[PDB]
Design a protein around this ligand. Structure first.
Ligand SMILES: *[C@@H]1O[C@H](CO)[C@@H](O)[C@H](O)[C@H]1NC(C)=O
Ligand SMILES: *[C@@H]1O[C@H](CO)[C@@H](O)[C@H](O)[C@H]1NC(C)=O
Ligand SMILES: *[C@@H]1O[C@H](CO)[C@@H](O)[C@H](O)[C@H]1NC(C)=O
Ligand SMILES: *[C@@H]1O[C@H](CO)[C@@H](O)[C@H](O)[C@H]1NC(C)=O
Lengths: 368, 443, 50, 49
């Protein structure tokens, strides 16, 4: 009747316990938390031991310092998927945990990075932009973002002018920039890691690729750290409202788990989860039902707003903030409330310093 | 080198190990060793502990895995272990054998099995064999459907054959309230072939809905990948009779054969590493906290594991983890809810044992070669099949397509169109026209 | 790529079209010297024009 | 083109009704039955399309 938590600090575990206790007053279930470990194998062994010690209906996972999302929550999800025990992620947007083929019984509290592609659609309709180019990286995240953008564009019968890809970690992207320079398109959309984004920023503004026109659109990882340090003025980045916050995510996760447990308690034929990985090898026989109950659960009102789960177990109806870099600063110029984008009363600058939105399309008069 | 072979649950006996001793591997310079380990737990903690004990206590570098259950989490756990331990792991005959896409980077985990693209290519070859150029596509919101559709469309576009590809469906199936929507969009499948792609649980519901609509019958054929079939002996009382599926070779492939193949692959990779770039023939084992394993430089060894000949077998793998030249079989749902092997798929070939594809208005016709009446040409070298004014023509003695034509052929075509009947032309073997010899006819 | 001179009916039509709608041009000859048809490549069986 | 009988007395061949009904390619159908049988036939035809 208890739930498991894997946080990154003792304070986080105490906060989770306090939140679960508070939600209890609104059964005798009590919380259980385990800290992270440097070794992935050690983390898997610890999670297995915790599961064996007491039956767990749901497991929450967080991100410690030096996240390395590619392998931080992966062991927990892999261990929990054997018995089909739902696992909720607190701060993870790698987009690899969305496919049910690999990660089974997984839920998200924050939208993945790929969903940012949707954010680059209202700006495509409110600014009258039709010719764009993509600098997506060559990896799962970049492929997912490109696929989502192409699917969104195909609805209106207008796809990207040219989609280019670059191997991750490359130190020479001059060829791609030169190829994309003569394309009669001024809107540039980038989707890469911090180091890759910083590398692309260098050797790009060198060939007058910044200034007049040349609207730049990026996500959230691009404007951060080294990439942000080298980011040119007029960059239109996206920021998550409550992505950094952890206590709020814990509170909403606890509330949703409690609501799902209360809803499931009414139903009959509720088989108890196995009391130990060793010996037990059959499926829970109720994991799919608990996952279905957890999904499609319209939470009344959480600290981070309305809680909705997508068909892939991802966060639904999120809120983004549009940031425009200017004078080595960052200011908010609009808010995307999941379905639409509303600008604020602040002026929007452009890479060329103009006060009017560039057309973003330069037709060529020299024909071959 | 020491390769550990792990068997879980019911398996063979130590006799298989004998095949690992009296073989070309022993005579090779690799001089490998085998330490068979049998387990009956099949749990993540148990598997991890066994792997760690084998790696630490014993000096080994390669692992061959073979389970008995159908749990797919075993493959993911093996991939995770390989990524962490930085040691090659081969999964065969079980959950580890199930093909999983999007493997973790720097993970040297391989398994026996085909990909979605290979199954789509096999389906297209089967369709082209019997001249089924009109079909549709039905899929659901399941991972891999995009790759399936893209492969089908790419194959159709880059070909000189005349395909149809009338309609393609999505079948959300996620909204419970939209139950009638599935039936509404299912009334557009006039094409004979369907080529469904979905999970077994969704497959049963889709089949029931189609039967309610009336898409299951003598005039409609369904082809599905191995995912829909699942367990061969677990027909859910709803699959229409005559369903065609593509599966991996599970009958003419023994567990000892797979173990020998894995041992040979590992030994050949080790020998190739020793011969070329002999700086480090085989890195030593390790333990927990493998961060100091960068000295091993397994990247060089990884490129060698994707090239194995084995006395003319081409056991090379792919950069993803699936073998490039697998063995595939075509199964058909018999009348008494059974699956029978109809044909096998070689590297680039097809050995279907049915030349007519047996199931009222369908009769056979015999023709003879004549100068102005029945001219027997050959298939078109450009597209591989005949074209306008020509019809398929069998040739007994096993057969060979000829695509006959001529005046009598045109008359037969017009007569068939007028009377609305189907046929299958074939040439005669003995006797030209017919004469009573010893009271018996011929030709 | 020898820079030869060319003229004729098509050149006159192109000049008139360029004069009508303001745009410059850069004429060059085809490499294989063929109008174009769909053919098959020996490797990869990639059907393409020429 | 063709004529049908649609013997509704034997419901065991109900699956056949949707089968033989998916053959009338002609626009005009000229149905003839009772009101209840007419409603049943119309529902089956709508399901078939
Ligand atoms: C309370 O939490 C602790 C975790 O330290 C756990 O061992 C114990 O089983 C929990 N109590 C109940 C009744 O589950
Ligand atoms: C996180 O959210 C909580 C609300 O529960 C708030 O009190 C806290 O200040 C937030 N932290 C940051 C860094 O915004
Ligand atoms: C988002 O804001 C727009 C303002 O134009 C409003 O029409 C829409 O209903 C809002 N949607 C949500 C989910 O708040
Ligand atoms: C081309 O000529 C037109 C006159 O019809 C003029 O309006 C336009 O500016 C010219 N374009 C140039 C000079 O690039």
């Amino acid at each position: 009747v208890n739930i498991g938590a894997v946080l990154s600090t003792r304070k986080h575990e105490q906060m989770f316990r306090e939140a679960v206790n508070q939600a209890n007053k609104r059964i005798q279930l009590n919380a259980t938390s385990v800290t992270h470990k440097p070794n992935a194998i050690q983390m898997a062994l610890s999670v297995c031991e915790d599961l064996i010690s007491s039956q767990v209906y749901a497991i929450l996972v967080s991100h410690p310092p030096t996240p390395n999302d590619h392998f931080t929550p992966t062991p927990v999800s892999y261990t929990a998927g054997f018995y089909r025990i739902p696992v909720l992620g607190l701060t993870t947007r790698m987009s690899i945990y969305s496919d049910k083929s690999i990660h089974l019984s997984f839920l998200r509290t924050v939208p993945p990075y790929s969903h940012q592609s949707s954010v680059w659609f209202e700006m495509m309709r409110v600014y009258s932009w039709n010719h764009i180019i993509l600098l997506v990286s060559d990896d799962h995240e970049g492929r997912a973002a490109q696929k989502r953008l192409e699917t969104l564009l195909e609805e209106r019968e207008s796809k990207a002018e040219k989609v280019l890809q670059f191997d991750p970690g490359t130190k020479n992207v001059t060829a791609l920039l030169m190829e994309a320079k003569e394309l009669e398109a001024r809107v540039i959309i980038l989707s890469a890691s911090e180091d890759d984004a910083a590398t692309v920023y260098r050797a790009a503004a060198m060939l007058n690729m910044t200034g007049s026109g040349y609207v730049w659109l990026v996500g959230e990882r691009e404007i951060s750290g080294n990439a942000l340090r080298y980011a040119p003025d007029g960059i239109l980045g996206l920021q998550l409202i409550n992505g950094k916050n952890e206590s709020a995510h814990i509170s909403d996760a606890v509330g949703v788990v409690a609501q799902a447990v209360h809803e499931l308690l009414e139903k009959e034929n509720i088989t108890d989860p196995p009391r130990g990985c060793v010996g037990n090898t059959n499926i829970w026989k109720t994991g799919p039902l608990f996952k279905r109950v957890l999904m499609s659960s319209k939470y009344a009102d959480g600290v981070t707003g309305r809680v909705e789960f997508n068909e892939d177990g991802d966060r639904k109806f999120a809120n983004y903030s549009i940031m425009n870099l200017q004078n080595r600063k960052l200011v908010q110029v609009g808010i995307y409330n999941g379905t639409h984008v509303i600008p604020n009363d602040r002026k929007i600058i452009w890479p060329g310093g103009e006060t009017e939105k560039p057309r973003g399309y330069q037709m060529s008069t020299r024909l071959k | 080198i020491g390769i550990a072979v792990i068997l879980v649950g019911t398996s063979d006996e130590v006799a298989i190990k004998d095949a690992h001793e009296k073989d070309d591997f022993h005579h090779l310079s690799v001089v490998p060793r085998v330490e068979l380990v049998a387990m009956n737990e099949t749990d993540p903690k148990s598997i991890i502990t066994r792997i760690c004990d084998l790696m630490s206590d014993r000096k080994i570098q390669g692992v061959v895995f073979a389970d008995d259950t159908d749990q797919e989490a075993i493959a993911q756990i093996l991939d995770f272990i390989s990524a962490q331990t930085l040691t090659p792991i081969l999964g065969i005959h079980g959950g580890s054998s199930m093909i999983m896409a999007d493997k973790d980077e720097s993970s040297m985990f391989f398994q026996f099995g085909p990909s979605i693209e290979q199954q789509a290519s096999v389906m297209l070859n089967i369709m082209e064999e019997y001249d089924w150029y009109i079909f549709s596509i039905v899929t659901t919101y399941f991972p891999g459907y995009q790759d399936f559709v893209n492969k089908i469309r790419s194959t159709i576009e880059n070909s000189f054959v005349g395909w149809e590809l009338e309609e393609v469906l999505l079948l959300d199936m996620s909204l419970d309230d939209g139950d009638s929507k599935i039936q509404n969009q299912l009334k557009k499948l006039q094409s004979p072939i369907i080529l469904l792609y979905c999970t077994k649980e969704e497959a049963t519901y889709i089949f029931e809905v189609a039967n309610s609509v009336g898409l299951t019958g003598y005039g409609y054929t369904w082809i599905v990948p191995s995912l829909v079939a699942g367990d061969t002996d677990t027909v859910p009382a709803e699959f229409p009779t005559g369903l065609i599926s593509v599966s991996y070779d599970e009958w003419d492939y023994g567990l000892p054969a797979r173990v020998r193949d894995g041992i040979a692959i590992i030994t050949t990779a080790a020998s190739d590493m020793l011969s070329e770039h002999s700086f480090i023939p085989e890195p030593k084992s390790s333990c927990y906290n493998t961060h100091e394993k960068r000295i091993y430089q397994s990247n060089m060894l990884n490129r060698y594991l994707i090239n194995v000949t084995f006395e003319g077998r081409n056991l090379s793998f792919s950069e993803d983890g699936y073998q490039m030249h697998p063995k595939l079989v075509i199964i058909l749902l018999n009348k008494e809810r059974k699956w029978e092997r109809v044909g096998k798929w070689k590297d680039k070939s097809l050995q279907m044992k049915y030349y007519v594809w047996p199931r009222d208005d369908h009769l056979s016709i015999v023709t003879l070669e004549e100068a102005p009446f029945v001219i027997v040409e050959s298939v078109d070298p450009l597209s591989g099949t005949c074209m306008r004014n020509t019809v398929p023509c069998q040739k007994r003695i096993g057969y060979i397509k000829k695509c006959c034509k001529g005046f009598c052929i045109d008359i037969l075509k017009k007569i068939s169109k007028s009377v609305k009947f189907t046929y299958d032309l074939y040439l005669v073997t003995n006797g030209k026209h017919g004469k009573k010899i010893n009271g018996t006819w011929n030709g | 790529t020898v820079p030869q001179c060319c003229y004729g009916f098509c050149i006159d039509l192109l000049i008139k079209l360029a004069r009508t709608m303001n745009f410059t041009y850069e004429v060059h000859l085809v490499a294989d010297g063929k109008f174009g048809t769909q053919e098959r490549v020996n490797n990869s069986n990639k059907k393409e024009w020429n």
